[PDB]
Design a protein around this ligand. Structure first.
Ligand SMILES: [Br-]
Ligand SMILES: [Br-]
Length: 339
């Protein structure tokens, strides 16, 4: 290997799956916690947490491309088009719901929200009566609008812009009746690991079909977000570092999926294209994926908070894998090897 990292097999139209798996694998802090999960009493092809432990172990250890058949079987997306029916954030919620669920009542409880959960305030403010409604809202990922948007900064501007509730569409202000009002969101916190989907694939917009937008959309290596926070912290600015770029070539139907990562967070990028992993330029991982006027562009970005980068990407050793886990896998390997 000229990269030191191994790829994942092409085993069907799994689309964004391999890309997402590498992205999660190189979230070292997540990966260590996953190894710690008590799975001894689980059924191999019925347990998502165990299946993920298998894939991570193999990605950490194998010199050969890693298979995912037991993993897809474990969360039940086994059909020809089962991945074409969903999107990357849905797969992501399935995987890490299953994982956080399993982590409840164990020594690594709380790992997932610690890494991925942020807080927003959602507000509704009546224009002409003293009524306002403020809610805490948690999120684990952010879907950013890109149509008509030149870059990530304006997607965020659009995200937190005020929506007007009037005309036909007045707000039901309960005791106050129908009322004109303003509705919006403000960021309270941003998580150590920030998952941003770029809404290139969307909608049934006067077509009653799903399309892919291939227009140019720029994102930076370094992403400052303090501006969008309701309240700022001097000792922890919301500066974010680009970790992964999930890429699609093609359009609203077919197409090829790859991911660019700089696993150590040092600006040294690799391209993961299923079983082929290769070192690439920064330019190829970043600007080359702005798209525009190819059909080869980013639909998801992973950023890590700069203050948390060293810890999120803490080194993993083979010792971080408990022996009991090592034995169940090794024995599985042994059975399989009679084939
Ligand atoms: Br397999
Ligand atoms: Br930008």
């Amino acid at each position: 290997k000229h990269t030191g990292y191994v790829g994942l097999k092409n085993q069907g139209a799994t689309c964004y799956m391999n890309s997402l798996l590498q992205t999660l694998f190189f979230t070292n802090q997540l990966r260590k916690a996953v190894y710690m999960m008590p799975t001894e009493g689980d059924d191999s092809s019925k347990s998502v947490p165990l299946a993920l432990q298998r894939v991570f172990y193999e990605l950490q250890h194998s010199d050969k491309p890693v298979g995912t058949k037991k993993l897809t079987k474990s969360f039940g997306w086994e059909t020809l088009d089962s991945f074409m029916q969903h999107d990357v954030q849905e797969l992501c919620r399935v995987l890490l719901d299953n994982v956080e669920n399993k982590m409840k009542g164990t020594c690594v409880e709380g790992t997932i929200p610690k890494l991925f959960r942020g807080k927003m305030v959602s507000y509704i403010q009546c224009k002409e009566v003293d009524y306002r409604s403020d809610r805490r809202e948690d999120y684990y990922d952010i879907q950013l609008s890109i149509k008509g948007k030149k870059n990530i900064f304006e997607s965020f501007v659009d995200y937190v812009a005020v929506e007007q509730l009037d005309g036909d569409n007045k707000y039901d202000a309960g005791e106050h009746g129908l009322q004109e009002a303003e509705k919006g969101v403000k960021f309270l916190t941003l998580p150590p690991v920030l998952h941003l989907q770029l809404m290139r694939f969307m909608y049934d917009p006067q077509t009653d079909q799903n399309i892919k937008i291939n227009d140019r959309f720029e994102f930076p290596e370094q992403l400052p977000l303090d501006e969008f926070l309701q309240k700022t912290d001097p000792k922890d600015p919301a500066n974010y570092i680009l970790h992964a770029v999930l890429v699609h070539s093609g359009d609203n139907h077919g197409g090829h999926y790859v991911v660019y990562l700089n696993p150590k967070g040092d600006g040294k990028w690799c391209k993961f294209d299923d079983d082929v992993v290769s070192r690439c330029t920064k330019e190829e991982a970043i600007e080359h994926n702005y798209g525009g006027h190819h059909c080869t562009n980013a639909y998801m970005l992973v950023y890590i908070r700069e203050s948390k980068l060293s810890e999120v990407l803490q080194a993993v050793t083979d010792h971080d894998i408990p022996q009991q886990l090592v034995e169940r896998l090794q024995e599985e390997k042994r059975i399989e090897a009679q084939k």
